[PDB]
Design an enzyme around this catalytic site. Structure first.
Site, PDB file in Angstrom:
ATOM      1  N   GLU A   1      18.449  70.344  16.663  1.00 24.72           N
ATOM      2  CA  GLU A   1      19.755  69.735  16.857  1.00 24.72           C
ATOM      3  C   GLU A   1      19.748  68.793  18.061  1.00 24.72           C
ATOM      4  OE1 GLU A   1      22.968  72.575  17.588  1.00 24.72           O
ATOM      5  OE2 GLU A   1      24.267  70.908  18.233  1.00 24.72           O
ATOM      6  N   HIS A   2      18.998  69.135  19.124  1.00 23.78           N
ATOM      7  CA  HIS A   2      18.854  68.273  20.300  1.00 23.78           C
ATOM      8  C   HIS A   2      18.030  67.026  19.972  1.00 23.78           C
ATOM      9  CE1 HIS A   2      20.129  70.829  23.879  1.00 23.78           C
ATOM     10  NE2 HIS A   2      20.237  71.668  22.845  1.00 23.78           N
TER      11      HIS A   2
ATOM     12  N   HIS B   1      17.958  75.274  16.859  1.00 28.45           N
ATOM     13  CA  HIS B   1      18.774  74.745  17.935  1.00 28.45           C
ATOM     14  C   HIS B   1      18.051  73.600  18.645  1.00 28.45           C
ATOM     15  CE1 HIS B   1      20.615  74.643  21.931  1.00 28.45           C
ATOM     16  NE2 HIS B   1      21.708  74.666  21.169  1.00 28.45           N
TER      17      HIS B   1
ATOM     18  N   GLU C   1      20.070  75.699  29.679  1.00 28.28           N
ATOM     19  CA  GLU C   1      21.190  76.195  28.892  1.00 28.28           C
ATOM     20  C   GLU C   1      21.181  77.719  28.891  1.00 28.28           C
ATOM     21  OE1 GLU C   1      20.485  73.876  25.197  1.00 28.28           O
ATOM     22  OE2 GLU C   1      22.673  73.642  25.116  1.00 28.28           O
TER      23      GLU C   1
ATOM     24  N   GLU D   1      13.317  67.815  26.488  1.00 27.59           N
ATOM     25  CA  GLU D   1      14.440  68.666  26.092  1.00 27.59           C
ATOM     26  C   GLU D   1      14.141  70.113  26.453  1.00 27.59           C
ATOM     27  OE1 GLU D   1      17.809  67.731  24.754  1.00 27.59           O
ATOM     28  OE2 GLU D   1      16.601  66.147  25.683  1.00 27.59           O
TER      29      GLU D   1
END
Ligand SMILES: CCCCCCCCCCCCCCCCCC(=O)OC[C@H](COP(=O)([O-])OCC(O)COP(=O)([O-])OC[C@@H](COC(=O)CCCCCCCCCCCCCCCCC)OC(=O)CCCCCCCCCCCCCCCCC)OC(=O)CCCCCCCCCCCCCCCCC
Ligand SMILES: CCCCCCCCCCCCCCCCCC(=O)OC[C@H](COP(=O)([O-])OCC[N+](C)(C)C)OC(=O)CCCCCCCCCCCCCCCCC
Ligand SMILES: CCCCCCCCCCCCCCCCCC(=O)OC[C@H](COP(=O)([O-])OCC[N+](C)(C)C)OC(=O)CCCCCCCCCCCCCCCCC
Ligand SMILES: CCCCCCCCCCCCCCCCCCCC(=O)O[C@H](COC(=O)CCCCCCCCCCCCCC)COP(=O)(O)OCCN
Ligand code: HEM
Ligand code: HEM
Ligand SMILES: CCCCCCCCCCCCCC(=O)OC[C@H](COP(=O)([O-])O)OC(=O)CCCCCCCCCCCCC
Ligand SMILES: CCCCCCCCCCCCO[C@@H]1O[C@H](CO)[C@@H](O[C@H]2O[C@H](CO)[C@@H](O)[C@H](O)[C@H]2O)[C@H](O)[C@H]1O
Ligand SMILES: CCCCCCCCCCCCO[C@@H]1O[C@H](CO)[C@@H](O[C@H]2O[C@H](CO)[C@@H](O)[C@H](O)[C@H]2O)[C@H](O)[C@H]1O
Lengths: 75, 438, 383, 61, 124, 54
Positions: free
Chosen positions: B52-53, B49, B129, B122
């Site tokens: 993906e960022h 994940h 999140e 990030e």
């Protein structure tokens, strides 16, 4: 091209139809066996049940053929 | 009759699969990867994940800003998602902007910077999140559902990963993940809409030819999950709506019971009080629920993975004193898949599904998603003729036999969120998985 | 909040006897329920008192009843009150059941109180039959003999069951002692079922003589129906007084003043008057087992009234043809009663068979036909 | 202690063969045996107890 | 019996000239002897209401019809408890005996019966 | 195990039938077993043991 969907209404009564009931027919059978076994078990002590039913069963049936010796019976 | 899906390979083992539609003017090209969170261990859980960022944070050529501009200038958009078993990266564009989009995707996958400065930036975004998924109740429910059903196993882990890992993910482990997993034999380049197959194969030879091949190439969609009957209760009296999921272990993509499980799921079906037609649906559960106001909605599901699945139902309700009735009637409808279903329900569900499986594919992105999913789970696109034949092979005997081995008297995984005081304990729920009268 | 509503125990009483919302137009036929409760209380009080002086052993039973009559202070009153209240109990229960049938009290949503009601009626019959045996006079013995021998008709096991009930080979001491224990118990069972049928009723409330909803216009049970019940309580007590003090043996059989004698058979063995219609039904069928089935069916057939009544309207107040049919049904039930105590002689044998057919055809043919036609006459007649 | 997706430790209790038919069958064997002795005990109890109503020894004499 | 049944059978009779010639006069006499009009009721006020279908039909009555029905039930209840009959304008005249409820219950039942049929469909 | 489950346990009707049949068997066999054991531990003492003298 199809103008109309193709279907019929099956006969039904009180929300039962034959396809559904037919699936349960065997289950009624087993429940009936369960009720039969249970009923017979409940009256296994009744002398008539032994005399008429249980003593007639092959092999096993001698379990229910029991005589009190005349010497040991006041009645 | 939809156009044929063309399929080619490169030498490295990258599959190219395309389905053209000369009636549209847009195209969705992208890369489906047979890899996801399930490929992480406990220490690097969250890496997929995280990547993906970073994929959108700049490459060896284009910086973050240049990347933004290049896509803006293309005119369409790029999108990505990471799941437990699958990663997707696609680009929707105009017909003649397809070579640009393939080139950008090839760049962000092969040649991403993963600069320590961007990792560090990030690391906060992703940390935030963790505290905002909390609002997406369906996702909260399904993530707890996987966590408990596959307790302490890779499928049970979340995609975001723990807070601890987010703070310790390095560019090294990011690079290692994508080097081990994003190999050519696990990837499919997919084009749908206004794409020529032969053009797409040339673009693949231009951009994706220097992709690593894995040492041991297994077929696409190659995987042992041990389901735990269990429950998670997240009671919150301040929430007005209860969200409940109940599931049993279901079927994998390649199960012989895959279609039988879909038909059984269609017999229960979905319901939503806000849709006008839902009060008139044929499903028995739908009728019980609507007549008695037991729920705002329910949605049956049959999720598949490579080696397992979850089959069950997701319910939402404001009726907090009748949650017991809602759960009771739902599980009694499941019991009837074992005891009572006949050709009446089975043929009705097959009718509804024969159309449903085709209806779903109504845009280039849906078509691309269908080609990509099928190629990465089954190794081939299954033609609608084959799908129609497999559905037709499902009989009422198959449904009853499947339900008797999968649902009847089986352990469930159960998640409840919100005002769930009325949800009874595990035993009373699990006792509804059988009927004493049968 | 008032205590009567706040406290859970008080609130249960409150819900049934005080704040209970009743239709404002119940007529005097809604008073039999409280008379039945009164009969039950009298039977419990007098019955428990007789139990303090009665001896269940066959050598002493009949004499213990004479001791009650002769030596126990007010024993004559307690005995005659108990014996006559048994008859009044059946008059009130037939009135209550006839009310229910005329006014459609068996229709939805009151099927469940009606069905438990049918069981109450069966328990009352058993209770009263066993209590009559306790005297151990000639009618006691011979009635027990013939009624218990009907069980012999049960196929295969029937004879064995009879010997098991008697505790021996004929009606004797074991049978009397067990009938005493069961006669003491059965009224408590009956009180529980009476309570169950009221709790079942409480979901719909009382029906009313017009057959419409009363939800538009309710009256509290107290004081209105409390004070209206007192009128019939005192009317009942006046009838009670006339029998108990002035004619205490009018409803009885003289043969029950002769001690049981297994050798001599009485001239005519008949049940107490309230069982006579069922006895006539049994005589009508020549087969033993046939007769027993018919006799039981005559009571259990009450359970099908909810189905065979096809009317879209509840009750007979506005149905002239149904009212005529009901009149004939009731009078036929009384004629069956009379035929239960005549001798088995011409021409009463055939008449009993015709009355039996009429009894059953009410449920199976006439009520379904008449109720169907009346539905159509209401519709066409009011267009 | 904070994440609700980290299921608490149930390894001290979990059976490895929890989804097998053998696992279920064992528990139903216990339930079934219990039901069987309860049926046999009820039958014995009812039969011996109700026999009090059959002719006593002095009557049979 | 269902209102649907009653209405359909009645329509069969009203169609047949012979049948109507003999049934309609009887039905009119029946209604006169029934005597519900002497308590100010309309025929439809007598229909059993403690049923899901009938409760739904009553909820669909227009407010005016609903308020008037409540008054006729209360008024009839007061005549019943007083042992009196209506007089004058309280007596329902034959032209006032309108089938205000029949269309609502026939629609409720139509759907209920269609639902039962469609629950038993068999794809051919 | 699957077979056994499927035949005797899965349907409650079958499970109850099996339980009742087993109860019947248990009752008859247990009776005979106790009778024999009782006679062995009380050997020479019971009427049946001395009856032959008379
Ligand atoms: C036993 C224990 C003792 C307790 C006695 C309690 C009995 C009381 C009871 O229920 O009946 C009284 C009862 C009076 O009760 P009500 O509440 O005034 O009216 C009830 C009727 O529904 C109202 O019926 P109606 O208003 O149509 O009036 C009819 C009645 C006239 O009723 C009057 O009292 C006037 O006259 C008759 O029916 C006689 C028939 C003609 C024979 C000639 O008497 C009857 O009406 C008996 C008619 C039965 C046939
Ligand atoms: C004997 C035959 C009796 C037939 C009754 C016919 C109706 C009648 O005139 O009764 C007056 C009244 C008529 O009352 P109603 O309630 O129909 O009418 C009141 C007046 N109007 C119509 C204006 C609203 O009926 C009763 O009160 C009937 C109760 C029946 C009780 C039967 C007991 C018999 C026991 C045997 C049990 C089995
Ligand atoms: C007191 C006498 C009790 C006799 C019990 C007779 C046998 C019933 C029994 O054992 O119940 C097991 C059964 C079944 O127990 P169960 O409900 O745990 O099993 C259901 C799941 N299957 C069918 C897959 C095994 O219970 C009942 O049927 C309830 C009756 C008990 C009383
Ligand atoms: C002998 C049997 C009757 C004796 C009791 C009757 C009451 C005696 C007079 C008392 C009285 O009238 O006062 C009322 C008491 O009644 C009451 O509170 C009771 C009202 C009626 C008495 C019994 C109710 C019978 C109903 C059911 C019969 C059951 C039979 C089954 C065994 C209260 O007057 P108020 O309370 O109206 O208000 C008025 C303001 N306080
Ligand atoms: C519904 C309640 C009851 C009914 C219908 C009922 C009915 C009867 C009947 C018909 C008799 C025969 C009376 C006679 O002709 O002498 C009787 C006798 C008797 N009953 Fe009851 N009874 C009831 C409740 C009770 C209760 C609760 C007891 C408590 C023990 C009881 C004790 C007796 C006794 C001891 C006798 C014998 C003495 C005698 O004949 O008077 N009864 N009963
Ligand atoms: C011990 C015997 C009984 C007692 C004490 C008893 C008592 C009552 C009482 C107090 C009520 C409410 C008031 C009333 O309507 O009168 C009632 C209603 C009723 N009873 Fe009984 N009852 C008995 C036996 C029976 C029997 C044998 C039946 C039926 C065969 C029956 C069926 C009903 C029904 C259907 C109602 C509701 C009637 C209505 O309000 O429309 N009861 N009972
Ligand atoms: C000894 C103990 C006896 C317990 C007996 C239980 C028998 C219950 C059978 C039963 O419920 O049958 C249901 C079946 C119709 O199915 P459905 O419409 O409920 O799905 O119903 C019909 O088929 C009719
Ligand atoms: C007639 C003999 C007198 C004794 C009463 C009988 C004892 C057994 C009665 C209890 C059985 C339970 O009975 C049940 O009680 C509750 C409260 O009491 C009632 O409840 C009713 O009254 C209360 C207030 O009075 C309301 O909160 C409620 O909306 C209403 O339904 C039920 O309508 C009744 O069905
Ligand atoms: C709804 C249930 C169905 C009906 C219930 C049946 C009621 C009566 C059944 C049989 C009662 C008598 O049945 C009889 O029981 C007794 C035990 O009590 C048994 O008797 C056995 O054990 C007793 C002591 O336990 C010994 O004294 C005796 O010598 C021995 O034979 C008889 O072998 C059996 O014939």
């Amino acid at each position: 091209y199809v103008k109309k969907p193709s279907y019929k209404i099956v006969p039904h009564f009180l929300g039962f139809n034959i396809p559904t009931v037919s699936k349960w027919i065997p289950i009624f059978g087993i429940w009936g066996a369960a009720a039969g076994i249970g009923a017979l078990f409940l009256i296994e002590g009744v002398p008539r049940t032994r005399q008429d039913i249980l003593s007639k069963i092959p092999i096993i049936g001698e379990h229910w053929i029991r005589e009190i010796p005349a010497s040991d019976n006041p009645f | 009759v939809s156009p044929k899906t063309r399929t080619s390979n490169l030498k490295n083992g990258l599959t190219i699969a395309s389905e053209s539609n000369p009636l549209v003017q847009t195209a969705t090209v992208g890369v489906w990867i047979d890899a996801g969170s399930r490929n992480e261990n406990a220490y690097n859980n969250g890496t997929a994940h995280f990547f993906e960022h970073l994929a959108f944070k700049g490459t060896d050529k284009r910086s973050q800003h240049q990347l933004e501009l290049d896509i803006e200038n293309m005119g369409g958009h790029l999108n990505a998602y990471t799941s437990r078993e699958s990663t997707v990266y696609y680009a929707k564009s105009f017909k003649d902007d397809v070579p640009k989009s393939v080139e950008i995707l090839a760049d962000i996958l092969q040649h991403s910077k993963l600069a320590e400065s961007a990792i560090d930036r990030e690391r906060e975004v992703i940390t935030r999140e963790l505290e905002e998924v909390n609002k997406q109740y369906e996702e909260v429910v399904f993530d707890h559902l996987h966590a408990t059903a596959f307790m302490n196993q890779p499928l049970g882990r979340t995609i975001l990963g723990p807070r601890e890992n987010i703070q310790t993910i390095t560019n090294t482990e990011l690079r290692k993940f994508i080097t081990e997993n994003y190999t050519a034999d696990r990837m499919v380049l997919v084009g749908a809409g206004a794409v020529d197959h032969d053009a797409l194969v040339e673009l693949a030879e231009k951009y994706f030819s220097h992709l690593p091949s894995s040492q041991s190439p297994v077929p696409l969609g190659t995987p042992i999950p041990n389901f735990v009957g269990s429950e998670v209760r997240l009671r919150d009296d301040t929430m007005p709506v209860a969200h409940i999921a109940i599931a049993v272990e279901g079927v994998s993509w390649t199960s012989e019971d895959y279609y039988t499980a879909l038909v059984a799921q269609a017999i229960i079906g979905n319901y939503d009080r806000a849709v006008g037609t839902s009060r008139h649906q044929g499903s028995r559960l739908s009728n019980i629920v609507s007549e008695n106001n037991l729920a705002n909605s329910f949605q049956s599901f049959s999720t598949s993975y490579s080696d397992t699945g979850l089959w069950g139902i997701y319910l939402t309700s404001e009726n907090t004193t009748q949650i017991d009735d809602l759960v009771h009637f739902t599980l009694k409808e499941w019991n009837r898949l074992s005891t009572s279903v006949s050709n009446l329900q089975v043929e009705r569900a097959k009718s509804q599904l024969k159309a449903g499986l085709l209806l779903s594919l109504d845009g280039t992105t849906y078509v691309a998603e269908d080609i990509g999913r099928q190629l990465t789970t089954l190794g081939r696109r299954v033609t609608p003729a084959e799908v129609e034949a497999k559905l037709e092979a499902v009989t009422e005997h198959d449904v009853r036999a499947w339900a008797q081995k999968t649902l009847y008297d089986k352990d469930i995984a159960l998640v409840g969120l919100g005002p769930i005081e009325g949800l009874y304990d595990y035993n009373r729920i699990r006792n509804d998985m059988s009927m004493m009268r049968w | 909040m008032a205590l009567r509503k706040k406290n859970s125990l008080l609130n249960m009483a409150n819900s049934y006897v005080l704040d209970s919302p009743q239709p404002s137009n119940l007529n005097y036929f809604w008073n039999f329920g409280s008379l039945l409760a009164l009969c039950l209380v009298i039977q419990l009080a007098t019955g428990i008192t007789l139990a303090m002086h009665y001896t269940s052993h066959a050598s002493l039973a009949f004499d213990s009843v004479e001791h009650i009559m002769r030596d126990v202070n007010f024993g004559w009153f307690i005995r005659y009150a108990h014996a006559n209240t048994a008859s009044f109990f059946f008059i009130c229960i037939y009135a209550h059941m006839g009310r229910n049938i005329y006014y459609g009290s068996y229709k939805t949503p009151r099927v469940l109180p009606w069905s438990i009601g049918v069981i109450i009626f069966l328990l009352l019959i058993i209770t009263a039959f066993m209590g009559y045996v306790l005297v151990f006079g000639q009618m006691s013995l011979w009635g027990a003999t013939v009624i218990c021998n009907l069980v012999s008709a049960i196929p295969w096991l029937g004879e064995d069951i009879v010997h098991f009930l008697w505790g021996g080979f004929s009606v004797g001491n074991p049978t009397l002692q067990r009938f005493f224990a069961l006669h003491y118990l059965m009224p408590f069972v009956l009180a529980v079922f009476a309570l169950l049928h009221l709790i079942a009723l409480h979901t719909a409330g009382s029906s009313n003589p017009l057959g419409i909803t009363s939800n538009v216009d309710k009256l509290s049970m107290h004081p209105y129906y409390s004070f209206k019940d007192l009128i019939t309580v005192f009317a009942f007590l006046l009838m009670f007084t006339l029998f108990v003090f002035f004619s205490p043996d009018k409803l009885g059989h003289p043969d029950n003043y002769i001690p049981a004698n297994p050798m001599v058979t009485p001239a005519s063995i008949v049940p107490e008057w309230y069982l006579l219609p069922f006895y006539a039904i049994l005589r009508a069928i020549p087969d033993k087992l046939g007769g027993v089935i018919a006799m039981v069916a005559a009571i259990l057939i009450l359970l099908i009234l909810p189905i065979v009544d096809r009317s879209i309207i509840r009750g007979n107040a506005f149905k002239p043809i149904s009212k005529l049919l009901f009149g004939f049904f009731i009078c036929n039930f009384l004629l069956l009663g009379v035929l239960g105590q005549v001798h088995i002689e011409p021409p009463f044998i055939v008449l009993g068979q015709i009355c039996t057919i009429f009894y059953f055809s009410y449920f199976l043919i006439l009520l379904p036909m008449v109720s169907t036609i009346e539905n159509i006459f209401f519709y066409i007649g009011s267009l | 202690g904070k994440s609700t997706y980290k299921i608490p430790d149930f390894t001290p209790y979990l059976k490895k063969d929890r989804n097998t038919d053998a696992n279920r069958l064992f528990s139903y064997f216990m339930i079934g045996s219990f039901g069987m002795l309860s049926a046999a005990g009820a039958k014995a109890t009812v039969q011996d107890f109700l026999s009090n109503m059959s002719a006593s020894a002095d009557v049979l004499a | 019996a269902s209102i649907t049944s009653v209405v359909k059978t009645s329509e069969l009779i009203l169609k047949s000239p012979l049948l109507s010639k003999i049934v309609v006069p009887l039905a009119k006499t029946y209604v006169k002897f029934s005597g519900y009009r002497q308590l100010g009721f309309k025929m439809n006020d007598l229909i059993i209401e403690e049923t899901p279908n009938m409760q739904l039909a009553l909820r669909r009555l227009p407010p005016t019809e609903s308020y008037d029905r409540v008054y006729r039930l209360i008024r009839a209840t007061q005549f019943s408890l007083s042992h009196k009959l209506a007089t004058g304008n309280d007596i329902t005249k034959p032209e006032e005996d309108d089938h205000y409820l029949i269309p609502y219950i026939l629609d409720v039942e139509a759907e209920a019966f269609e639902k039962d049929a469609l629950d038993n469909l068999e794809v051919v | 195990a699957t077979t056994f489950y499927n035949v005797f346990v899965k349907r409650n009707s079958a499970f109850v039938a099996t339980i009742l049949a087993s109860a019947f068997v248990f009752d008859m066999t247990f009776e005979t077993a106790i009778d024999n054991f009782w006679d062995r531990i009380n050997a020479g003492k019971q009427w049946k043991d001395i009856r032959h003298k008379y």
